[PDB]
């Protein structure tokens, strides 16, 4: 009838248990001979290990109607082949059975690691943290779809913000990681649980402990990347409301987008994460479903913001003429703004024509715009410096700030 | 006394001359045995080939007090080893002398290219354009300093926006490119000329022809990248005016920055390009001269904008605690804004305390902020769609837009 996912959890507060379990689970996921449902179970096990009570979190947060989770209390055991068994009796086969040229095996890149069992908290958290990181990054990879900028951006980020919290000794093989990549690809359950986690971590009062905090970070990245193209296109393509929207060739897209926006809205407070949950959703909300309007919006965007740097239209359905069209619309819009402003002040059309021209040119010359921005900011900054020289600073303020930099 | 740079230019309108000259010059730059000054000459030759009269442009735009340019009118010749000679007589040695296991040689990656001489305009422009591109990209590389995101970003950009204008058949070896990299590194003259070009292309009335346009693009990229870190730091580090600026450990930096801003200002309309002209300037204006305040400003920035995606603090002097400090300042500033607003409306401090808390939390939860932004935009977009359904569109507008998309 209903699908059960077995998920192992620690059976006592001790770190040795927690740790040995983590070890055996990592070990288990690397086994080439393990079945999907089991793997998923093990992963939800591992994903839950960063709270004092994994089983609790799992119980309260799981939100999948098609499956039922059977938690499995695990404890130490000097008598089993594994260092572990269940409660409660003589279920040490269950235990050993459960964990059954060591080359077909996923493990760590560093072959000098023999095990990741550990008796201290701080040390358990480095291992757990480092592993959890790689794991969540995989998800991000899946969600950022074509873009390759994140196996980069995000590993880089984690590298520089988490140290000495994310450590290289505990980098696992591609072979190991691919199992996880795969389970994420193939299992709606696992994905539901990960989204649930995201939500839980978000809704936490605190006081986020290091690992929670970093996972939270990855999460934010994923969420903004998920629907980037979409929002980009709406923001610079539709909302600008340039005459080019009337062109016959946007007609079909605008309506797709209308569908996408209505769908988006109908999804309520879940709307952002949906591209994580089903890939088809992510593919349908992708730029590919309205490539022209997107290219246009790209143009409009970079024209409008004078930026550039960070954009990425390195894609197959990117049409550069639509980029140029967007840009030109932006220019002509400037022209219009200026002729309008001009006429209000009490100037004639004859005389406003030229104003329109010059405005368009003003928009066009982006080097000058940059120059102006820079100059502007430099002026501002000198102003602030001067100001601080003057009325310097309440020692109270400095005291609170010190009190800040402390923690 | 004064240093002369010999720079060859075409001696007639014909494309065969222009083309053969380009060929011999490329050929010449690849010669491992050529001297610096000569190479620079040849490069300024090649850089000028995209206007109807290279010599004119060179004459009017060169702005270097320490050197004097001797243009050299070149024309075809069925009698020299080269297909070229000078005016005006019997200076065909000058000519041949000038161009004197072919492995030590820079040339094209594609060994199937025998020569790039050509009799048509459209075809000369593909070669010239493709070469000029690689050239200007090198400069960009030099100016973007540590960042490696541009040998990427910018080649990608040029790839996708210029096609079929920038062609792979005409990719030159690293070996060839390195000569140019080197001359740019070692010669203030060449750099002055390139900046002059930048200015000229900027100041052009038009109607920018393809090649001009693309070079212009590269230029804009370079200019905004040049002082990014700097403006970033001023914008989010100083201008925000958070109490943390009072900390003893920013004291020394703020004053460096003050110096940098004063210097910047003193440089007038040249101020942006100066980081191109001397590397020491670029190094001094780099993040390395005020690393903490920069890290802080990074934090403040991503906290403030909820972005993320495109940032790059992958650097050695990046201090993440200062990032966190920046962030926290942003939060506390939110808190403050809200307590203030609260008290104006007629609320007590007791009651405003909590308001401050909640505001801080509002700032902190960035996933929620994202969510709100997305939702907001979706609403906006549906609104626009609805609006367009209603009062659709002046056919006149559509007509002008059509008239646009045409060109």
From Swiss-Prot, chains A, B:
Keyword Thylakoid: no
Gene Ontology molecular functions: RNA binding; structural molecule activity
Full-protein interval shown: 31 to 408 of 525
Protein name: Nucleoprotein
Region of interest: Homomultimerization: 334-352
Taxonomy of the source species: Viruses, Riboviria, Orthornavirae, Negarnaviricota, Haploviricotina
Record region (Ncore): 1-364
Family to which the UniProt record says this protein belongs: Belongs to the paramyxoviruses nucleocapsid family.
Entry's free-text remark on domains: Ncore is globular and carries regions required for N self-assembly and RNA-binding. Ntail is an intrinsically disordered monomeric domain in the C-terminus.
Species: Measles virus (strain Edmonston B)
């Amino acid at each position: 009838i209903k699908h059960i996912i077995i998920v192992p959890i620690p059976g006592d507060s001790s770190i040795t248990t927690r740790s040995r379990l983590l070890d055996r689970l990592v070990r288990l996921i690397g086994n080439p001979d393990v079945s999907g449902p089991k793997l998923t179970g093990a992963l939800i096990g591992i994903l839950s290990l960063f709270v004092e009570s994994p089983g609790q979190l799992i119980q309260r947060i799981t939100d999948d109607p098609d499956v039922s989770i059977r938690l499995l209390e695990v404890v130490q055991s000097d008598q089993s082949q594994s260092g572990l068994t269940f409660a409660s009796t003589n279920m040490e086969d269950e235990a050993d059975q459960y964990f059954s040229d060591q080359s077909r095996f996923g493990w760590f890149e560093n072959k000098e690691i023999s095990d990741i069992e550990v008796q201290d908290p701080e040390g358990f958290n480095m291992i757990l943290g480092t592993i959890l990181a790689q794991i969540w990054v995989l998800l991000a990879k899946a969600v950022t779809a074509p873009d390759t900028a994140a196996d980069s951006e995000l590993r880089r980020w984690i590298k520089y913000t988490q140290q000495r919290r994310v450590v290289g000794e505990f980098r696992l093989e591609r072979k190991w990681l691919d199992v996880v990549r795969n389970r994420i690809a193939e299992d709606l359950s696992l994905r539901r649980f990960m989204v649930a986690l995201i939500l839980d971590i978000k809704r936490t009062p605190g006081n986020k402990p290091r690992i929670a905090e970093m996972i939270c970070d990855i999460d934010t990245y994923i969420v903004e990347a998920g629907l980037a193209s979409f929002i980009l296109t709406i923001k610079f393509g539709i909302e600008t409301m340039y005459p080019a929207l009337g062109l016959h060739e946007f007609a079909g897209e605008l309506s797709t987008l209308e569908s996408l926006m209505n769908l988006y809205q109908q999804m309520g407070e879940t709307a952002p994460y949906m591209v994580i949950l089903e890939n088809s959703i992510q593919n349908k909300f992708s730029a590919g479903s309205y490539p022209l309007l997107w290219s246009y919006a790209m143009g409009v965007g970079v024209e409008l913001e004078n930026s550039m740097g960070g954009l990425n239209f390195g894609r197959s359905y990117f049409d550069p003429a639509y980029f140029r069209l967007g840009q030109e619309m932006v220019r002509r819009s400037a022209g219009k703004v200026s002729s309008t402003l001009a006429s209000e002040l009490g100037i004639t059309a004859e005389d406003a024509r030229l104003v329109s021209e010059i405005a368009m040119h003003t928009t066009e010359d982006k080097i000058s715009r940059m120059a102006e921005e820079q100059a502007r900011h430099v002026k501002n900054g000198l102003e602030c410096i001067r100001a601080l020289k003057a009325e310097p600073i309440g020692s109270l303020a400095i005291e609170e700030a010190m009190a800040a930099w402390s923690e």
